[PDB]
Design a protein around this ligand. Structure first.
Ligand SMILES: [Cl-]
Ligand SMILES: [Cl-]
Lengths: 142, 141
């Protein structure tokens, strides 16, 4: 509950545009994919970008329990957040979340058929560091 | 399945000291944790260490289906392996897998009570590059 974590975890989040996203894959195996962080609100909410794959979409439709992971291997520190994700289908949201260097990935702009936007809402997390971890609920850390 | 994207998969694995490990967690949620690579054999077998944790031991005994993810540090790309994991509780295995480098995390050595070794066996791979992925079965390649 010390203020350092939220600030330290926030630096961790801010330090890369890439987030590792864990999902429930086929046949009971977890799957991890890299996604792009379009926006976040502290540790409460993340808006992410990934390529439209019917596989991923169908999977998230049936099971939206996910986790996010942020790491710096140099400190051997990481942050994991656990929560649920929803696909944002409306163009309004897609437009408001669009950023520079979305363009690198989605040449046809907001209307690129491969631009999918997601909203992750964190329930809890775990900060790992010095081979220990501190688990917290989001509603506590604020 | 071609040898270009599999040469990059192996290079990525050989350069990796830390690997992201995805496990099936409480209440239906995936969980991810960084673990250290001790040894591997191609893309089929990976020996990992992490700190001893009774929560993780119980998790993995209920459900040993996991994935590994190797981040490419120089471009938007990565390798995901999927398979099953087993904890190596025996000192013989821990002695064999011990590498110079472990002394940083486990200062009491092979007998450090926080030293846990695990053996992952991959069944399927997925290589991500250029916003695409190629899926392959490890035993075919
Ligand atoms: Cl709206
Ligand atoms: Cl020595």
């Amino acid at each position: 509950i010390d203020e350092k974590f939220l600030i330290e975890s926030n630096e961790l989040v801010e330090s890369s545009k890439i987030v590792m996203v864990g999902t429930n894959g086929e046949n009971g195996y977890p799957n991890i994919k890299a996604m792009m962080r379009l926006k976040h609100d502290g540790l409460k909410k993340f808006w992410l970008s990934t390529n439209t794959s019917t596989r991923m979409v169908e999977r998230l439709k049936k099971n939206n329990k996910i986790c996010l992971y942020f790491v710096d291997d140099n400190k051997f520190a990481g942050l994991m957040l656990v929560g649920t994700i929803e696909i944002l289908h409306d163009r309004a949201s897609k437009e408001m979340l669009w950023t520079d260097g979305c363009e690198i990935y989605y040449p046809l702009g907001i209307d690129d058929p491969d631009y999918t936007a997601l909203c992750f809402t964190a329930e809890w997390g775990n900060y790992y560091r010095h081979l220990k971890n501190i688990t917290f609920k989001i509603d506590e850390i604020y």
